[model samples]
Target: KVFGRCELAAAMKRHGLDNYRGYSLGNWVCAAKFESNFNTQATNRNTDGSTDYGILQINSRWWCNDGRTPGSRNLCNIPCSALLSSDITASVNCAKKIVSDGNGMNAWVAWRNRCKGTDVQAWIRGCRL
Candidate 1:
């Protein structure tokens, strides 16, 4: 775990996630919470036999090479393990690329189910930039 609630928000801001590429900080916070609870080392196995990696829970099927998976798009051009680091530069960059691919946060199922269009004020409420 790299950050707590408020700490993650601040870190996301420091990483330029505050409105960067049209994504709101609150949305980032909400997504991060559901995806990984701000734990950079978070990983989950999917029903489809794929695994999601890191704080944003980026998938190995498309975003990175986890070694166990084949035919990986590896669009982020990084090892999935890299996303597990305390330094999330690789995760953030890969997330930016995922958004750039036109999925928006919709690329993350958690965002669609738990964050999109919801009242995310609590994610940032009382949180200082």
Candidate 2:
């Protein structure tokens, strides 16, 4: 499922990503926008042979186990396929884990390049969250 911007914001906030790890909700929203454009089924193959999955584009190399990425740590301990579902419960949970694991929002290159030090509030300006 592809979510609208504000809809994605509400969903993500409902999952406790708002201000998690000192990152604002708009930061997460911006990451999702640049990462997957709110597409639940998004996937991107990396040059390193790993794949990023789902809305937040969690990587298979260190997060979910795709059973295909070489040297995957599978720190999230779930199948990569789980991240592609329309229900974002697992995706959000794993995202929280990523931040809590000390990677913070910097774990996503999209966030670093597009959201970091920017006016992230613009990403959620019309949202009533």
Candidate 3:
């Protein structure tokens, strides 16, 4: 596992997830727990047949139809390895990509705020995948 806060923080910092100051570790942790148990290799194919891949649960399969295809749904962008390839920071970046969709950003903001000061382990609420 990635050791030390500095190393871990560095990894996350790549994704704009952890800054030296006001960065919220709790938000990242909480987001991971709920999204994929922090599994860099998590893919969720819902009953509805939707596919979400990667640590941040990047849903490349449908990301295109949404009109927010910042990167390719294929390799070099949303690579298959994103599921759990140790690129911890990029995983979160994948997530941030999904969350920044204009008005859609609101829900993600709510999720982040929900875990502001709460314990990540015990804090569980609904976040529609």
> What lDDT does the true structure give each of the candidates?
0.88, 0.93, 0.49
| Candidate scoring better on TM-score of 1 and 3 | 1
Q: Which 10-residue window of candidate 3 scores lowest in summed lDDT?
A: 120-129
Q: In candidate 1, which residue pairs clash?
A: none
Give the root-mean-square deviation of each candidate in angstroms.
1.2, 0.9, 8.1
How many residue pairs clash in all the candidates, one count each? 0, 0, 4
* Per-residue lDDT of candidate 2, residues 24-108 (tens digit): 9999999999999999899999999999999999999999999899899988889999999999998999999998877688999
Better of 1 and 2 by lDDT: 2
Better of 2 and 3 by TM-score: 2
Model 1 local distance difference test score:
0.88
lDDT of 2: 0.93
Residue 47 lDDT, candidate 2, scale 0-100: 97
lDDT of 1 by residue, 1-129 (tens): 667888888888888888977978998889988999889999999877779999999999998998888777889999999999988788888888887788788988899999998997679998888
